[PDB]
């Protein structure tokens, strides 16, 4: 049927939790390598470039 | 001669008919050639004749119609052929004038209380 429960709702604080855990893992080079990203020559992992 | 409709519209009426039956005649004897085992070349011509008869008939009908709706231009009643045929539902709607009719009372409101153009400050 079409009225199967397709969508799900997650607590807003749990959504915000996951984004904090996602960003915080983007600063660990061992976790980004393990994701397969070829980043062995990036100067610094939390890569920041000027607003230009 | 490839009969083109650009070439027919300038001609007078009763000479178009003189050209119409001329093609009617040629179509008949072409149909006779179809049963008497005629050449393949003539058999392919009856399609040219058939579509040429449709052309001259089309010009005749068109020029006759526009002479009519030019004769019924300023008249009140006109034949049902010349009245605009568009979805019977909207042949029944009120005119472009009737639906614009406002009562003397309703007109008096617009003159007295027109909707103003304003703006509120922050």
């Amino acid at each position: 049927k079409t009225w199967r429960r397709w969508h799900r709702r997650v607590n807003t604080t749990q959504k915000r939790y996951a984004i904090c855990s996602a960003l915080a893992a983007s600063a660990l080079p061992a976790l980004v390598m393990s994701k397969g990203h070829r980043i062995e020559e990036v100067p610094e992992l939390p890569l920041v470039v000027e607003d230009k | 001669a490839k009969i083109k409709a650009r070439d027919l519209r300038g001609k007078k009426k009763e000479e178009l008919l003189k050209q119409l039956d001329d093609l009617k005649v040629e179509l008949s004897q072409l149909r006779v050639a179809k049963v008497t085992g005629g050449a393949a070349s003539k058999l392919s011509k009856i399609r040219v004749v058939r579509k040429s008869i449709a052309r001259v008939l089309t010009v005749i009908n068109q020029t006759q119609k526009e002479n009519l709706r030019k004769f019924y231009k300023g008249k009140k009643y006109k034949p049902l052929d010349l009245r605009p045929k568009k979805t019977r539902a909207m042949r029944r709607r009120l005119n472009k004038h009737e639906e614009s009719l406002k009562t003397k009372k309703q007109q008096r409101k617009e003159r007295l209380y027109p909707l103003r153009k304003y703006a509120v400050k922050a």
Partner: protein, 59 residues
Amino acid sequence: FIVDVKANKHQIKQAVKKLYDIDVAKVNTLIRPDGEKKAYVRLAPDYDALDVANKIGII
């Protein structure tokens, strides 16, 4: 002739009389099983149908 299925013996008589400039004695019509109407047109004795067939092409 294979006439149109709507025509009468009267219309058929005056048609051949006008298309081929000939006189007709009588016309017998039947409706073929396939649908079209066949008309046997007997010419008046003063016209020979054998030559009339040559003017219109059938022979």
